[PDB]
Amino acid sequence: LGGYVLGSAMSRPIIHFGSDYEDRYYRENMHRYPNQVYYRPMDEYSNQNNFVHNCVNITIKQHTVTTTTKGENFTETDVKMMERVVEQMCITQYERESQAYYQRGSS
Incomplete structure (x- = not known):
């Protein structure tokens, strides 16, 4: 066993934002999500x-490796938007988790 987990791509790349201003740049980031x-x-x-x-x-963290594939760097603003997509992805693996979110709303 290695450790690198895989589960194909993800559907519905359109992630929530809330910042109409950021949405502008998000259009270019979504392509590199x-x-x-x-x-x-x-x-x-x-x-x-x-x-x-x-x-x-x-x-x-590990993303830093693949970052070389394009030979570029990431900004605090870009990484921020990318961090939002990563989270939603973690849940995508197992819908059983989100199932609890829908039921009840105790915070």
Whole structure:
């Protein structure tokens, strides 16, 4: 076993934003949106909520490698929008999680 998890691409790349101003740039970022999510067993010593957020940090980290494929850099603004797509992707793997979100609304 290696560790690199794969599950094909994702449907509905249109992610929520809320910032009409950012939407402008999001149009160019959506084309380069993240289509790969990875996670290691090392990340499993905190609550269930932190586990999800952490998983997002892992992907972006390794992302630095593929970043060489295009030979470019990422800005705090670009990475921010990309971090939003990664999260939604983590849940895409298992809809069972989102199923709980729909039911009830206790915060």
